[PDB]
Amino acid sequence: DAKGTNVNDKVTASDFKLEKTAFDPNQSGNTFMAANFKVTGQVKSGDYFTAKLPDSVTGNGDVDYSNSNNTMPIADIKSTNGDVVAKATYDILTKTYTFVFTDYVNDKENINGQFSLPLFTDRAKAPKSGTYDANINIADEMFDNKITYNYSSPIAGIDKPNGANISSQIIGVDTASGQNTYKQTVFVNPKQRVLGNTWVYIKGYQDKIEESSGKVSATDTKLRIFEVNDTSKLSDSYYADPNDSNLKEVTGEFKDKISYKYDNVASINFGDINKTYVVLVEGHYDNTGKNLKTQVIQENIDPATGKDYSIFGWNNENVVRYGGGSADGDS
């Protein structure tokens, strides 16, 4: 039963198709890979074959498995009767899918089947809009593709020269481990305007507390705040590396400026600013099973006049996609 011999040399994949080759990961866009596969000869329980993803795509997308040993279960490959033909997992770090045959295969031959698995952007490795190679290995054979990411720009806000402007994206949600963490990137003033008396609010909900599982609080939330040297260098994908020299962490300058006084919201007092800041949120959600929905808000004035107030909000929520597959062999 345990993972045994690699039988890529016995498995041929075919009729490979992506569901689509262009989408917008900032509006829940994703694709699927679909392929047929067939086994030449016989395999035995524990034999396995693999598929390997390149830098531009991931199998997990905005779902985070770092608290589950970087491993995600995948849907079982099942026969018509419903019997499990292969169990499958995916390694987040090595981007490798492994399909391990069960004892169903022991008395069979010329097993063949098919799968459809959801594929997502890699926000870190594909940080800008554009076209990327997405050459995918299945069973030691390459299937070449191009994928185009047209990210909805994170640079959004009120249409005045001193207008409030802010955006965010939840780029990691831990659904597996039980810890219920989430990771959110917030871009404050991505327009890089000159703003007076700036306040930012990070909420664990949108309009209705009871309709989100998010919990923002001093004990559930940690914030890191970075001043951005060059705004042009920020991702379109909302990925932001805390170690990138373009970001200067200034968290220690905000110890008197962050308040969890109000319900399910953190407020941050930015004051008079003229740069973009990144806020990396490490949060948690509760066990109500409600959707995780959030909103960030920024308000400010015109610093030269003291007036021309404005306020802008930005909602986040994520969606889940599923895979499926089947296989049968002759006796």
């Binding site: 990961p25 900032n26 509006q27 829940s28 866009g29 994703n30 199998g59 997990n60 997308g61 905005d62 779902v63 995600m72 279960p73 995948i74 849907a75 997992t89 995916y90 698995l117 959801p118 997502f120 909805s152 994170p154 955006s167 965010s168 994206q169 939840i170 780029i171 949600v173 659904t175 597996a176 909302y238 909103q295 909000g313 930005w314 909602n315 986040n316 929520e317 994520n318 969606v319 889940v320 996609r321 599923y322 895979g323 499926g324």
Partner: peptide, 13 residues
Amino acid sequence: ASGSSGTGSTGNQ
């Protein structure tokens, strides 16, 4: 819905 939205897979769990 407004703002932006993400997407991922839980591996059918």
